[PDB]
Amino acid sequence: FIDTNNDGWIEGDELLA
Ligand SMILES: [La+3]
């Protein structure tokens, strides 16, 4: 995956790239 807000985790309700 490529994390939009660059922490490398997926968070609930975070915007997907
Ligand atoms: La994130």
Backbone phi, then psi, for 13, in 5-degree steps? Answer: 65, 25
Cα gap 16→5, rounded to integer Å: 9
As given in the structure block, the two tokens for residue 14 are 């975070």
What contacts 10, CB < 8 A, 6 or more positions away?
A: 1, 3
Instruction: Report the SS3 class of residue 9.
Output: coil
Q: 11 — alpha (psi -120 to 50), left (phi > 0) or beta?
A: beta
CA distances from residue 16 to 4, 6 in whole angstroms, order as listed: 7, 11
| Distance in Å, CA 14 to ligand 1 centroid | 7
| One-letter identity of residue 10 | I
Cα gap 7→5, rounded to integer Å: 6
| Distance in Å, CA 1 to ligand 1 centroid | 10
Cα gap 1→16, rounded to integer Å: 10
**Residues flanking ion ligand 1, Cβ below 5 Å:** 3, 5, 7, 9, 11, 14
